[PDB]
């Protein structure tokens, strides 16, 4: 289906190609009814209709014209999961440099523009000016400028002179940075020096300079111009038990960025003075930097009460991000859990499994067996039969168990002998009966322990449970040659 | 506790957690390591694509189980698409080549 996953920078044309509509207003929802906002964060035209194949407001209540968009609704007409894949984009009034490429240690923009992090932040937070191709004056290109350094220069070099600040200035610097030219220079600088420290300092700068030229990543893609917004479905707005909406943290972050961006557009309309729009663009810079990776800047923002709110990078990183919590480990259907007990009559390829857990874990196999015999007709009838638990479904259950292994698993699984596959033997009771020798593999005593059962659904998984993971097959520990089914 | 097929969570299409919420047991990370440690490959594929996440995959699975055909149509985890949307919502351009 697909080979390798490619990661690169996001161009503003690429972010406009992802998008389906500019998210303007910060207004989340109506909150007194049920409708959203047109056109706010949770829009209709920009994303899609809440209801499946329905104009949320009113037209198309059947399956004929899927797509029409009347002026009374300003709504698309597709599936309920269509909004989960669609993303919006916020037209940031003032340019804002990414926090992941400005504070990554080492910063991506720190060893690329040959400028110290301290000086980079100063200019970025409207606290220092930066020169950009001044002209016939006595000033460098990387050298910065202060209020006093600019004031005097302003009265001195009033003509051909450029000295901006913030991301805008930074962007220009990156934009006007001949990559190829630097390569040769850096390469020649490394071959014309003997300084150990310098050599390592020059080889680390030229490595990230030639790597950028090898790919299609531009230097001006570091600064965020067309901020992208995550799909609503992925930032869900559900109410808890009551009458209020427990709102997510990302909605606070996006709503603040949009509030500030609207304020900055209005101030650039009104021609406010310099210090007002510097504070306004600085608050937008800090708002974007707080949205992307919260708390990497000075003390993290907070909604309720003093606890900081969770941003996008905190949806990725950590013990509870997407990798360690939803992609490497998942919650799993056809699974069960109960307290273990001994049952020493067992043979060591089989374990006891209660009838109530067996009828719950094997509901689709019982449904298929019931539909094969001809006892019932529709699926509903079978679900009523096992909801009532009549006298005939226990023979069905002993005919779906028979040669179908299950994966028993003790909860701190340390090595591979902590997941072993057994054959069930049905138990009048509510406790998993586990063969005693196998306990020395699980480190399972019987002082209140619990184990999980998992069902191999498909046919290759039943064969893997019988041919690789069966408890008769694990009689030697894989760490050495010593038997693990030693009598305890 | 036992679960064949219950409710599913909203943001990542995986089953809910707990007993009061009719949920399924967490096939955690060390169990994924313990199935990599055997040669069990189809068991892990249905343990994290069919049984857990992929919605069209699990409706195809439920029809195939009640008709007697033990077979899985794999597809993609929907939570990986959530990872793509969260990385893509930054300035980062993650894709799927070919």
């Amino acid at each position: 289906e697909f080979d390798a996953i490619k990661i690169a920078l996001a161009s503003p044309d690429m972010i406009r190609s992802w998008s389906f509509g500019e998210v303007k207003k910060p207004e989340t929802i109506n909150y007194r009814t049920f409708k959203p906002e047109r056109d706010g964060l949770f829009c209709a035209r920009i994303f899609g209709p809440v209801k499946d194949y329905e104009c949320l407001c009113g037209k198309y209540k059947r399956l004929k014209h899927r797509g029409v968009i009347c002026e009374k609704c300003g709504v698309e007409v597709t599936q309920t999961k269509v909004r989960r894949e669609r993303m919006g984009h916020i037209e940031l009034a003032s340019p804002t440099a990414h926090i992941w490429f400005l504070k990554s240690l080492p910063s991506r923009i720190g060893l690329l523009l040959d400028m110290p992090l301290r000086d980079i932040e100063r200019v970025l937070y409207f606290e220092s000016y930066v020169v950009i191709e001044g002209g016939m004056t006595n000033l460098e290109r990387q050298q910065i400028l202060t209020e006093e350094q600019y004031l005097d220069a302003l009265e001195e070099f009033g003509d051909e002179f450029d000295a901006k600040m913030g991301a805008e200035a930074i962007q220009a610097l990156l934009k006007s940075m001949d990559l190829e030219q630097e390569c040769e220079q850096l390469r020649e600088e490394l071959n014309e020096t003997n300084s150990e420290t310098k050599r390592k300092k020059l080889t680390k700068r030229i490595k990230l300079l030639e790597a950028f030229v090898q790919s299609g990543n531009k230097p001006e893609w570091m600064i965020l111009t067309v901020l992208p917004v995550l799909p609503p479905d992925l930032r869900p707005l559900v109410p808890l038990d009551g009458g209020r909406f427990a709102t997510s943290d990302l909605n606070d972050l996006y709503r603040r960025v949009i509030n500030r961006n609207n304020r900055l557009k209005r101030l650039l309309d009104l021609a406010a003075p310099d210090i007002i729009v510097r504070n306004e663009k600085r608050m937008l810079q800090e708002a974007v930097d707080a949205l992307l990776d919260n708390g990497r800047r000075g003390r993290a923002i907070t909604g309720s009460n003093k606890r900081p709110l969770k941003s996008l990078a905190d949806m990725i990183k950590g013990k509870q991000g997407r990798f360690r919590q939803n992609l490497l480990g998942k919650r799993v259907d056809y699974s069960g859990r109960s307290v273990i007990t001994v049952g020493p009559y067992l043979r060591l390829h089989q374990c006891g499994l209660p009838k109530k857990m067996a009828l719950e874990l094997f509901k689709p196999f019982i449904y298929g067996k019931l539909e094969l015999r001809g006892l019932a007709t529709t699926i509903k009838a079978a679900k009523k039969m096992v909801e009532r638990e009549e006298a005939v479904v226990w023979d069905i259950l002993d005919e779906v168990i028979r040669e179908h292994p299950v994966l028993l698993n003790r909860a701190p699984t340390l090595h591979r002998l902590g997941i072993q596959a057994f054959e069930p033997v049905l138990i009048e009771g509510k406790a998993i009966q586990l063969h005693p020798l196998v306990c020395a593999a699980y480190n399972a005593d019987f002082d209140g322990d619990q184990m999980a059962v998992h069902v191999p659904l498909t046919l290759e998984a039943q064969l893997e449970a019988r041919a690789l993971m069966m408890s008769t097959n694990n009689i030697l520990s894989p760490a050495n040659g010593e038997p693990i089914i030693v009598p305890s | 506790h036992a679960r064949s097929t219950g409710s599913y969570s909203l943001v990542t299409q995986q089953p809910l957690g707990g007993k009061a919420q009719f949920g399924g047991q967490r096939f955690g990370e060390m169990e994924v390591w313990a199935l990599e440690a055997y040669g069990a490959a189809y068991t892990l594929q249905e343990m994290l694509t069919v049984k857990s996440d992929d919605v069209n995959g699990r409706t195809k699975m439920y029809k195939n189980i009640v008709d007697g055909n033990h077979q899985m149509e794999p597809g993609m985890p929907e939570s990986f698409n959530v990872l793509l949307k969260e990385i893509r919502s930054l300035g980062i351009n993650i894709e799927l080549e070919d």
Binding site: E464, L468 | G39, Y42, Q45
Partner: peptide, 16 residues
């Protein structure tokens, strides 16, 4: 690409 799936990845690596 280790266990039972090593034959599948042999097949996919062969058919490129």
């Amino acid at each position: 690409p280790a266990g039972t799936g090593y034959a599948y990845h042999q097949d996919r690596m062969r058919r490129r």
